[PDB]
Design a protein around this nucleic acid. Structure first.
Lengths: 102, 62, 132, 60, 189, 52, 74, 134, 74
RNA sequence: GAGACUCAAAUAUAUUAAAUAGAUAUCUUCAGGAUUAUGGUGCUGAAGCUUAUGUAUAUGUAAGUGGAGCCGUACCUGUUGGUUUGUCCCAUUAUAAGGACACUAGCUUCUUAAAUGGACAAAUUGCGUCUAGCAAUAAUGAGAUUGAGCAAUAACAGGUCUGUGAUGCCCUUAGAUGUCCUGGGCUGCACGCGCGCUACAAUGAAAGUAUCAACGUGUAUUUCCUAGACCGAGAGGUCCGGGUAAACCGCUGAACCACUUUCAUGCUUGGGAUUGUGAACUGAAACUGUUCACGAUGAACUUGGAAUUCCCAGUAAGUGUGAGUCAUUAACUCGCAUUGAUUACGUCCCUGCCCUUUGUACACACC
């Protein structure tokens, strides 16, 4: 009868993750979407390391490359006609929303 | 020749190959002889020290 | 069991299925080098069944005792071929069929309070063995 | 001794003290509190410095 | 209530040498049961004096590379050696140990860079820290060569230097290699 | 059909360098196929700020 | 060059002879019983385990790689 | 006790080693067969070097000569798939020493990959021999 | 969890020590909290000090944290 | 430029934060002790035991059998499931509130942050040129939680035309240096040289037992991670899953080390090069070999000359593991954790290096 819709949020900027809890959850608990707070995911840090010189002739140094990906989880207990407006607004650069229908 | 001696003041350590504090040091029974000996290894102030050769100190200035 | 340490508590229980006729001996108990690291055979079979004491805490804390999750992580402390030492998988063999030696799935139907508690009743007697 | 003070902590210590010695305290922890008022900073260890140095000279 | 070092008493162990008293803090403040401390014992220059001794010995005998790193093996070897030093000369083996450590002190001259030349001259007195900590070092070696190609084990080998350094040492052991060194620096002095 | 051997779905040949078509210096496996010297050029803006 | 390669054996011809040497030799251990000749290295430990009639022994060290003993001092 | 230093075919036994490790002194057999062929000849492995009187060690020779009837499988042998006569052997310093130059002298006519490398002195298993082996 | 066959057991020294204080800090008594510290703090073996000394990351050009390997015919 | 700054466990969860962990709590279920209280029972045959066949060997019973225990509960010690706005409601197939109760019949310590806290230094100290008088003293998450990245002006005939559709010019083009095919080689060897691997053994090589990681990684236009059963000396193979990943592999329950034994220093059981043989795997294809299994084969090697490298706290070294390349191939390189020392806390002899002074007959600068 009543639906539970878990909505994960992934991005790279933690500020954009601070920007999606800035306005999505506040425009939903006015109508009580049962957010269960900002559910933090552990980050998926990506390390690559490479040499610097093409044609590696001399002083064999290296060069480390880092990448930080972060999520935060918003689960909701509401039917699908409720959450349709929240998918439209608010939108954010670099952030991704994953809600499946079927 | 079982003379003991305790230090009143450190002077400079001529380190580089043989770190030793050339230190002014007086005896216990002959405490008026504040001789300036050279002690290989790490030392602290007021450290009592065994000795046999208590006669001349290999004079080096600073 | 979570009593005193299972050095000798393994050692007694190895005798008891050997006592009770439930040996269920592998026919190559004097052949196998119990894994791809040993230069010599084991001394005897008296380890081969004895890891019921290990699963009594691993059914308790790790998993239902699947044989692939079993043989991997215990009994690997090896020096393999000379460039250099590495890890192993120990490749058990017949103690896949040591469930028959006991007579989503569960691995023992008697290690809940039935025959594990006998070993507890052995170690409660071993409290009285260690009473002097 | 070995923790000397750089230019920015030195060249701002004067320009706040000769102006706002009035209504200024000796208490470093509230002198921590007043640096965000009378000037701006991008980072909190600089207020650990630029309040620490003015209080290491305030009694002087 | 401060007792039970490993099996026996801890205190009433005096250092029988001026001038090493109050320098090797044995047991009058630090009733420590184990030779194992974790945190940090060389932070500034002044840290090897506020510490026990068997914690240094168990830090010391882990050597050779293939044995270095392992302090628990050193926890094995000295406590079982301690029973050999308790069974013979039924005095507390720490009282043997402090008598072992002061006879093994190279309380003499050494060699030093000349302020006009090379390492020729006489560092006429040695530091008490170098007296104690090389005395740990000069015995730590000789346990191994007493068991390199002998079938015998270093438990009884390290028991051999503790019995002779406690007294005046006999013919050259791990306790020696220093008393001979006292002579060749007395040759320049 | 003819004169083209090498059933290329085994070995390095030929799963090679979908960013530069250069073989002997390849980063193959991260889902990149980048020819790591070209990854120097195109490190950005495919994330990968250096930090430490 | 030391050789020491003796008859590794139960050593019955000196079994009664090693039976009497342990008094008053309180430094008994697997090295010193093979420091005495006709070397058994392992069962000469067991020779003192055959001395475990609670007589002339005090087995106080029971370990891997060393089992150090003491004679039964009265 | 009694006699300790025995004599078996083309070997000898010391009076200190266990019966399993002194079995390795025989050529052609390592410490594999300490548990394999001695318990198959019901020799007690904890017995010392003075023991195992000759009424027991001759049965070990029957395992040496006839390994197939003593429950030793084919993937626990020395040489498999002869292929000459197809039979399987474990040979202890009697025929194995002749079997070294055997299977080399056949391949000299064949001049195979690993055949003719034994003339000048090299390695038949592939290592870059240009650097090592001066 | 974590740690090792030495290190993880050393954290248990911090485990027993702080529990007695916190149960005495709020529940039993101020001086009961006091009488378990003073007898401890004479040397105390840092039973409550959680040193943050963890391992130090590597560097390229070496095998380890700070060591390296050299003499390419220098 | 340096610093400042950015990135990393220590830091009040005091705030909201979990399909990670869970703390808990009790509901439980997985129940021994008699540690408990015993009610019934106890020498009367209990407990325990076998035989018979049926049922598809277990079980039933009697006999067999045997001479004290039997059986139930609670307390003590353990699985489990939900304990999400708890219970009982409901709508619902079942969560919630709506209905009340504890009014909290599981909350956030915890891992995770998303924050701000965070030695945040007038911290006192016979004041050094009134200023940068070490002192260890003060804290008691904090005596830097502490390493990295970052890097100016001028330069080198350093290296890279073989990383590129970066390129001058040079060269070539149906007869290619281009190109695809089949081969071969890049691996071949009297020899020299460097990075690096296991050693040379009782602190050891074996057997056993105990039983601690962390960085990570894992398959939808490519064969990944593998759970489970099963078979096989092994190698592996079969059958059936999980998993696009806090959720599964996985609580990755890593190694060395701890604990009894076998050994009895004897090129030994140290050390595994060395060569046969079969059995295997991956792939069209394995041959100074693609690697891998067994039972043989046990050499050099016993601490290594002159020379000579590396480094100061969780560091050195010992000890694994992941990733990187990868049809299969680490024996190397980057990262990760574990075990954990000695020694310096200095100085300018040493090779050093920084525009201070001075010397010159040195240009391409003491080669």
């Amino acid at each position: 009868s009543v639906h539970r819709i878990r909505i994960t949020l992934t991005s790279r900027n933690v500020r954009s993750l601070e920007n999606v809890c800035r306005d999505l959850i506040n425009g939903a608990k006015n109508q009580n979407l049962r957010v269960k707070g900002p559910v933090r995911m552990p980050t998926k840090t990506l390390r690559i390391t490479t040499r610097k010189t093409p044609c590696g002739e001399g002083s064999k140094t290296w060069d480390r490359f880092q990448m930080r990906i972060h999520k935060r989880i918003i689960d909701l207990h509401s039917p699908s006609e409720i959450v349709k407006k929240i998918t439209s607004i608010n939108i954010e650069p670099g952030v991704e929303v994953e809600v499946t229908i079927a | 020749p079982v003379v003991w001696a305790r230090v009143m003041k450190v002077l400079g350590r001529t380190g580089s190959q043989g770190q030793c504090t050339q230190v002014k040091v007086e005896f216990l029974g002959e405490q008026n002889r504040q001789i300036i000996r050279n002690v290989k290894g790490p030392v602290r102030e007021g450290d009592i020290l065994t000795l046999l050769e208590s006669e001349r100190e290999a004079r080096r200035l600073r | 069991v979570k009593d005193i340490d299972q050095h000798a508590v393994t050692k007694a229980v190895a005798v008891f299925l050997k006592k009770t006729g439930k040996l269920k001996v592998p026919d190559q108990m004097d052949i196998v080098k119990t894994a791809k690291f040993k230069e010599l055979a084991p001394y005897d079979p008296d380890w081969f069944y004895v890891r019921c004491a290990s699963i009594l805490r691993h059914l308790y804390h790790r998993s239902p005792a699947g044989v692939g999750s079993i043989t991997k992580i215990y009994g690997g402390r090896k020096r393999n071929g000379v460039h250099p030492s590495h890890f192993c998988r120990a490749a058990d063999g017949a103690a896949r069929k040591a469930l028959q030696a006991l007579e989503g799935r569960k691995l023992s139907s008697i290690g809940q309070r039935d025959l594990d508690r006998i070993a507890n009743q052995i170690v409660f007697k071993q409290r009285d063995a260690a009473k002097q | 001794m070995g923790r000397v003070r750089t230019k920015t902590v030195k060249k701002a210590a004067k320009v706040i003290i000769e102006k706002y010695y009035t209504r200024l305290t000796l208490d470093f922890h509230t002198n921590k509190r007043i640096c965000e008022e009378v000037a701006i900073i991008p980072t909190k260890p600089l207020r650990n410095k630029i309040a620490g140095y003015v209080t290491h000279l305030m009694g002087r | 209530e401060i007792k039970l070092f490993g099996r026996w008493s801890c205190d009433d162990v005096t250092v029988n040498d001026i001038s090493l008293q109050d320098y090797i803090s044995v047991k009058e403040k630090f009733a420590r049961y184990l030779p194992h401390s974790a945190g940090r014992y060389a932070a500034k220059r002044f840290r090897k004096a506020q510490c026990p001794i068997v914690e240094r010995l168990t830090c010391s005998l882990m050597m050779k590379g293939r044995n270095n790193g392992k302090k628990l093996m050193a926890c094995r070897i000295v406590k079982h050696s301690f029973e050999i030093i308790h069974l013979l000369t039924g005095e507390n083996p720490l009282q043997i140990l402090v008598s072992a450590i002061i006879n093994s002190g190279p309380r003499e001259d050494s060699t030093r860079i000349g302020r006009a030349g090379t390492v020729r001259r006489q560092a006429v007195d040695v530091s008490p820290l170098r007296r104690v900590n090389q005395a740990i070092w000069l015995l730590c070696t000789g346990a191994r060569e007493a068991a390199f190609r002998n079938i015998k084990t270093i438990a009884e080998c390290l028991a051999d230097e503790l019995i002779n350094a406690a007294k005046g040492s006999s013919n050259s052991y791990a306790i020696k290699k220093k008393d001979e060194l006292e002579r060749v620096a007395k040759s320049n002095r | 059909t003819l004169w083209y051997s090498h059933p290329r779905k085994y070995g390095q040949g030929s799963r090679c360098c979908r960013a530069c078509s250069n073989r002997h210096g390849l980063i193959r496996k991260y889902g990149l196929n980048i020819c790591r010297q070209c990854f120097r050029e195109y490190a950005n803006d495919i994330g990968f700020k250096k930090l430490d | 060059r030391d050789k020491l390669n003796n008859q590794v054996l139960f050593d019955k011809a000196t079994y009664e002879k090693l039976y009497k040497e342990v008094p008053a030799y309180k430094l008994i251990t697997p090295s010193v019983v093979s420091e005495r000749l006709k070397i058994r290295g392992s069962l000469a430990k067991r020779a003192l385990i055959e001395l475990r009639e609670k007589g002339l022994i005090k087995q106080v060290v029971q370990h891997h790689s060393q089992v150090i003993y003491t004679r039964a001092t009265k | 006790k009694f006699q300790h230093i025995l004599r078996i075919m083309n070997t000898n036994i010391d009076g200190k080693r266990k019966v399993g490790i002194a079995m390795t002194a025989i050529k052609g057999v390592g410490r594999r067969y300490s548990n394999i062929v001695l318990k198959k000849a019901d020799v007690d492995l904890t017995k010392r070097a003075g023991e195992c009187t000759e009424e027991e060690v001759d049965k070990v020779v029957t395992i040496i000569s006839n390994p197939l009837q003593y429950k030793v499988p084919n993937w626990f042998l020395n040489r498999q798939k002869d292929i000459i006569d197809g039979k399987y052997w474990q040979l202890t310093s009697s025929n194995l020493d002749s079997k070294l130059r055997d299977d080399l002298e056949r391949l000299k006519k064949i001049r195979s990959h690993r055949g003719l490398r034994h003339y000048w002195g090299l390695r038949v298993r592939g290592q870059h021999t240009k650097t090592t082996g001066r | 969890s974590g740690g090792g066959h030495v290190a993880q057991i050393y954290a248990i020294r911090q485990a027993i020590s702080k529990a007695l204080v916190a149960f005495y800090q709020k529940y039993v008594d101020e001086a009961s909290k006091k009488e378990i510290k003073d007898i401890l703090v004479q040397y105390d073996r840092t039973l409550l000090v959680g040193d943050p000394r963890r391992c130090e990351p590597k560097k390229f050009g070496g095998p380890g944290a700070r060591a390296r390997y050299q003499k390419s015919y220098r």
